[PDB]
Design a protein around this nucleic acid. Structure first.
Lengths: 323, 49, 255, 324
RNA sequence: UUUAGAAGGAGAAGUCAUUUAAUAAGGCCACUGUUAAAAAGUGUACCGCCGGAUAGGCGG
């Protein structure tokens, strides 16, 4: 093994589907639900942007028509309900394309070493922690009275959570339901199982006629000008990759971690848009780390193995420029 | 190569394209309002060869 | 020696060759005539002893292999090329040539000449029809084969008819300018290849598919055409394409 | 005889149409179906690709707007349904061009010797085995709960299969339905029949609101490099060449098979687009094998005859090296 | 005897933070819906027996 394969690629081992939005009442949340539609809106603002003084002297007092969309609850429902699901696939049976066979054998050997060493328990525990504390609500988490989350596997309905008590900076390892679910997730990841299906339903209490924040569509120059919200089967919803970004916010092993002291989403270069600082520029980058794991066959600390396996769960285009 | 019926017999026909007619059609349709199709799929190296 | 009409109804063809020198879309009429002649040869190899006079094409559905752009134009697709013979056989990725493919739902009207034309001919044509390709496209299915005489028992569709008069009386110094001006003033006519030129002297050549036939090079020639409904048709003989050979000409005509 | 003819060309003896995608519920899979549609999608990612250090240190933290398409289930269905069909044609009548006459006679004589010897049963069994284990699902096979495959020939409905139990590496030659279908396939390849029509319907249970993976088209455009999915009359589907590639993955007779131990599709040089190295470079290629079969008239082991017949079934342009 | 014959495009992803559409008002006038018919086509078929055959036969 002298270099990376020219067509190395990976799939994703955590398939997340689109979420759907429903509204109901907290005292009857197990009995009925109602659809939540997206409404159009048009506003008349003022020219409040920063302008050069010459234009500012001539159009400071001009109106400005704008278009937008908004999604709000009704006057008789105060609880927002979010339903989605996750499919878990084995890590070893997810390598999509690779040219060299020896590289595939080496990758399989290293994955087997990590399975025999750790057993995929830490990453599974962190993923179910990110599920538990309801990080996927994003802007809907602020100003909520009661947030509850339940997880259903096949027909076994686990007892409800309380994501308000879970801190967003530390990961617990002693919750009974969290460890029980993480056991199945780790078994599926290692290869003892072949597939896992998990369904998540979340109830958020915010008050009557409040505002919800679904995902916003991305528009280019040719498209119409204005804010567009994401519609899923008529009702509002969230993107799959928006939810997946919240689940994989488990990276606490980057350099200069003690200075900042918060997890970041697992990226290739460790970039975090929340604070706008790269965290794995050269030395702890995934490209440099996996070049020492395979080509040099040099053993790494367990933190680097954790980060590498977390990246390989996500997958991507790890190709080479035709050496 | 195709076969064409000529009377009671057959003829072997070898088809060749028209480069100059293709270029003329390209420019004339470029300065026009006919629907047209661009059909951009030829690499630079293939066009050189 | 009775002459009737045979209708092949609602034949679905996919991946038919939709490319020409400067035409993308409807395949050349020579492909359909060659399909008819191949069907005639396959039948005459089965001791049926009948011949085909004219072919009429009725378009119902079509689809271009690709997608429409945001502005409105079409962008075509192509299959991943395999192993091109010659140089670079062992290369994993091969070169890409100009190509286009189409999907058609088309009906064929055939005029035949031969003894005792009856339902046995229909059974034979049903048995032997599912063995050939239409313009290089595989036949997926077909509605039925019918024996008809008049224009009343004809399904709804659009026939392709040769219209060279509009090309002739157009305004323009040369033929291409006449064609583009006729297509500018009229938004219903479409350009179709109809035949082949000669630009060569006949004889024998090395490397042909069959080294016994008379060989001569050709070039596809293009004319105009149009569409009209079934009920607007006056006589059943007007929409019947047929061969026409001349000194250096290998064309097909509606006359 | 000295060499291959200057113009030799066969056809494809296993024609396949384009598949179509439908969605339904597993308990009511035999009653109703619903159309499956492809939706557009826009994403905002980061610059995660490898970059030179200057370009990396400049564009480390830039946003990245991208366009794509996606297809997925609804919230009330948990079963994807695929319907398609296959047409089988005789091998002897599948030759479309042969300039030489003695070469055509020798080809016919060798094919006659092969059918008298074996009778195309092995390749028919391997093809129906590749049908039975649902190899054509590709990325849709992973993460499946129940995979059921049925096969209809003309007007007779054969018993349903279960692709989960079948292994993707070995081959089964004792299943009654497999042998029954392979008998008809070998008869149609033999020339006793004139054509064969097979109708294939596959149900796969993946769960509610999951993701499906139709074929991705190859297109070229200006200012548009997004992912484009294959739409077939509005619904999603798969290309014919994608299904045909999975069916002919039967070649287990290449050199060093005991090392890798997986079947590969049948090409002229044994090259598959997943290893990047041809498995039959010079000494087991189809060209020299068919040269020794025909020109030298030297008998070969049954594995080489199987490989040559598998190549002839696929079809191609097996003419001589052209000269200027 | 068909511009004939041949074909895996594929993996990865946070769109988004803000906002005052707003003031006035005359729909108006006139007008012929009327001439003829059968709910009627039996308008419903019930108490019983031999039948131990859910067979099939008969009394008012």
């Amino acid at each position: 093994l002298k270099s990376r394969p020219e067509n190395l690629s990976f799939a994703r081992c955590l398939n997340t589907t689109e979420a759907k939005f429903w509204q109901t009442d907290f005292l009857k949340r197990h009995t009925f639900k109602l659809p939540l539609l997206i409404t159009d809106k048009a506003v008349l603002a003022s020219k409040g942007h920063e302008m050069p003084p010459d234009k500012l002297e001539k159009e400071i007092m001009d109106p400005n028509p704008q278009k937008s969309q908004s999604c709000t609850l009704s006057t008789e429902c105060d609880t927002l309900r979010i339903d989605f699901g996750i499919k878990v696939l084995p890590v070893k049976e997810s390598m999509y394309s690779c040219s060299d066979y020896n590289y595939r054998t080496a990758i399989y050997q290293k994955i087997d070493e990590y399975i025999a060493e750790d057993g995929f328990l830490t990453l599974a525990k962190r993923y179910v922690n990110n599920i538990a504390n309801a990080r996927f609500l994003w802007r809907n988490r602020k100003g909520a009275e009661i947030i509850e989350t339940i997880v259903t596997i096949e027909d076994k309905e686990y007892p409800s959570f309380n994501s308000k008590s879970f801190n967003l900076d530390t990961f617990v390892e002693d919750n009974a339901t969290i460890n029980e679910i993480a056991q199945q997730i780790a078994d599926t990841f290692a290869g003892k199982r072949e597939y896992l299906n998990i369904y998540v339903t979340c109830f958020v209490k915010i008050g009557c006629a409040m505002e919800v924040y679904p995902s916003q569509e991305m528009t280019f120059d040719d498209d119409d000008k204005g804010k567009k919200l994401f519609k899923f089967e008529g009702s509002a919803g969230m993107h799959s990759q928006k939810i997946n970004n919240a689940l994989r916010t488990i990276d606490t092993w980057y350099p200069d971690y003690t200075t900042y002291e918060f997890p970041i989403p697992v990226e290739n270069y460790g970039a975090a848009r929340s604070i706008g600082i790269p965290f794995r520029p050269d030395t702890k980058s995934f490209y440099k780390l996996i070049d020492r794991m395979i080509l040099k066959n040099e053993d790494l600390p367990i933190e680097d193995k954790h980060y590498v396996m977390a990246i390989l769960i996500r997958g991507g285009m790890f190709s080479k420029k035709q050496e | 190569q195709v076969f064409f019926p000529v009377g009671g017999s057959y003829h072997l026909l070898s088809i060749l394209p028209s480069t100059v007619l293709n270029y003329e059609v390209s420019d004339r349709l470029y300065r026009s309002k006919i629907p047209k199709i661009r059909l951009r799929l030829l690499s630079s190296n293939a066009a050189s060869t | 020696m009775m002459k009737g009409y045979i209708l092949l109804e609602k034949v679905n063809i996919e991946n038919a060759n939709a490319f020409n020198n400067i035409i993308v879309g409807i395949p050349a009429i020579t492909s359909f005539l060659g399909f008819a002649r191949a069907l005639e040869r396959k039948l005459n190899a089965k001791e049926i002893a009948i011949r085909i006079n004219g072919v009429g094409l009725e378009f119902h559905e079509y689809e271009l292999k690709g997608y429409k752009n945001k502005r409105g134009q079409y962008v075509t697709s192509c299959p991943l090329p395999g192993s091109i013979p010659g140089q670079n056989e062992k290369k994993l990725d091969a070169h890409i040539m100009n190509q286009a493919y189409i999907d058609l739902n088309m009906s064929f009207l055939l005029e035949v000449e031969g003894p005792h034309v009856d339902m046995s001919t229909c059974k034979s044509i049903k048995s032997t029809m599912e063995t050939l390709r239409i313009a290089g496209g595989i036949i997926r299915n077909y509605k039925k084969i019918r024996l008809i005489d008049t224009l009343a028992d004809i399904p709804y569709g659009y026939f392709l008819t040769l219209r060279q008069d509009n090309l002739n009386d157009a305004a323009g110094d040369d033929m291409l300018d006449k064609m583009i001006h006729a297509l500018q003033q009229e938004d219903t006519l479409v350009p179709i290849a109809v035949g082949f030129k000669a630009l060569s002297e006949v004889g024998h050549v090395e490397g042909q598919r069959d080294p016994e036939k008379d060989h001569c090079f050709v070039e596809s020639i293009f004319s105009l055409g149009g569409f009209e409904c079934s009920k607007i048709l006056e006589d059943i003989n007007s929409c019947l394409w047929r061969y026409k050979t001349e000194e250096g000409l290998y064309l097909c005509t509606i006359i």
